[PDB]
Amino acid sequence: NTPREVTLHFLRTAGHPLTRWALQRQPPDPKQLEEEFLKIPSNFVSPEDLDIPGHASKDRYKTILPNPQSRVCLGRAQEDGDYINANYIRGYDGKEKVYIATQGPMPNTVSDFWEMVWQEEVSLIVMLTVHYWPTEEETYGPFQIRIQDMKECPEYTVRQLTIQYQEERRSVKHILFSAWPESAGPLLRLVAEVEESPETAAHPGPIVVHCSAGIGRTGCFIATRIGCQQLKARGEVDILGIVCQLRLDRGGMIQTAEQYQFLHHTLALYAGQLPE
What we know:
One of its GO terms (molecular function) is non-membrane spanning protein tyrosine phosphatase activity. It is an enzyme of class 3 (hydrolase). Monomer. Interacts with MAPK1, MAPK3 and several other MAP kinases. This protein has one domain (about 1-275): Protein tyrosine phosphatase superfamily (Protein-Tyrosine Phosphatase, Chain A, Alpha-Beta Complex). By secondary structure, it is an alpha/beta fold. The strands form two sheets. The protein has a nine-stranded mixed beta sheet with strand order 2-3-4-10-5-9-8-7-6, sandwiched between helices. The chain contains eight helices and eleven strands.
């Protein structure tokens, strides 16, 4: 069949389930992990595959585009069009819309970003390190953002934000991770922080994860989170399966073989930290 059908079939059927024991004590070697990684099709959508007039000015990178089937479509709160460079990401056991993977907002897409936050009832943003939040109080399109409180920790800064439209006020938690690797300690504390975050919206909405392109460390964070959940619930993890599912939702998730290998290391560390 067509190269598109080959790609989808691979992403749908590939898998390498590993027991907790094999991950910790007898893992695939780095050579095997690299080759396994390089077999995974990227599932990048070409510009010709999107019929969305005027999207280009809203893309940070021309070749990193949101897959049509899972893209986040904006309503009508602002500016015309429904386009943001963002995809819905399935979570643990294929549960819909657990995450939104998005690019770092540009000055012309900051209103779009907050429109997505408001529309999707997002209560948590994870940034992995244009500032799209105020030092005190800014207005972005129809939205007023205000810092309620801010605590600096050694590994991340947590901002509690208020988003206002217009007599309605919502709380959004913002975590800026300033310890991206080297070491997986901080990353797992970030995941614990994410897990410990109370829900604050009317209905549970997706967690927004971004840095710059929304595919590299964004993919690593989400793969890690899902991997931990698999290990906690099942005592095993299918990392190849996780990465394949991520690429179905957003092209190019997890950029390098080193990131792939580091995913194995991070989950091995999580496994060793599980309750006795």
